[PDB]
């Protein structure tokens, strides 16, 4: 694409600069260019990819929620609907872009459990964002579920219960159950079992790993408190 002439290392370097400047659209374009070099991503590079697109779609989703709320209140001219549709289409485009990167060809080249779970968790997230605005909706929801489920199966087989990627996967799959699948009891069960199994494995961890895991465990507990 437009990053095709820039060195892989320079794209990564500029993605890190863009993050420091809170220029997340730039950051995402740089990381897209880096992915499209065809090489697998390191752990740090996977995090950069995730941070970049998470922040881009996060702004879009928050905008979409504001406009949809106005649109709904208006139903109790076409401008509100039109502009909501404009944001929604740009949001779907970014989701399609990320899902395209995962399908071409990050996932199929990810053989290590940590990278494969990482990308499958991302796939579930971005189908979940598509589901938030969908009204093919059932197929989109099942795509999110299938991606999360494959990631869960690998993570439970290959990674300790305190692993941050596994914990973050479980947190977001539980949110999917609660917010998308209308399965609040499944969400609660998943978050509780995840929290309890990580608690029992904390004793194996260094101080630094302890901090990483307990941070995510607290977010699991926060949601359980909200849900119960």
């Amino acid at each position: 694409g437009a990053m095709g002439s820039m060195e892989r290392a320079s794209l990564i370097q500029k993605a890190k600069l863009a993050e420091q400047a809170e220029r997340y659209e730039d950051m995402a374009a740089f990381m897209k260019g880096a992915v499209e070099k065809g090489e697998e991503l390191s752990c740090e590079e996977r995090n950069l990819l995730s941070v970049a697109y998470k922040n881009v779609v996060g702004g879009q989703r928050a905008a979409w929620r504001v406009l949809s709320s106005i649109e709904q209140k208006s139903n109790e001219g076409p401008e509100v609907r039109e502009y909501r549709e404009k944001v929604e289409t740009e949001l779907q485009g970014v989701c399609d872009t990320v899902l395209g990167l995962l399908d071409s060809h990050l996932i199929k080249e990810a053989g290590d459990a940590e990278s494969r779970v990482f990308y499958l968790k991302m796939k579930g997230d971005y189908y979940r964002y598509l589901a938030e605005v969908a009204t093919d909706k059932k197929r989109i929801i099942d795509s999110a579920r299938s991606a999360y489920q494959e990631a869960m199966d690998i993570s439970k087989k290959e990674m300790p219960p305190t692993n941050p990627i596994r914990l973050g996967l479980a947190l977001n799959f539980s949110v999917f159950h609660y917010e998308i699948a209308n399965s609040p009891e499944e969400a609660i069960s998943l978050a509780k079992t995840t929290f309890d199994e990580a608690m029992a494995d904390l004793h194996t961890l260094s101080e630094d790993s302890y901090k990483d895991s307990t941070l995510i465990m607290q977010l699991l507990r926060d949601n359980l408190t909200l849900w119960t």
Partner: peptide, 6 residues
């Protein structure tokens, strides 16, 4: 519900 940041 809040999801996993970053």
């Amino acid at each position: 519900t809040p999801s996993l940041p970053x």
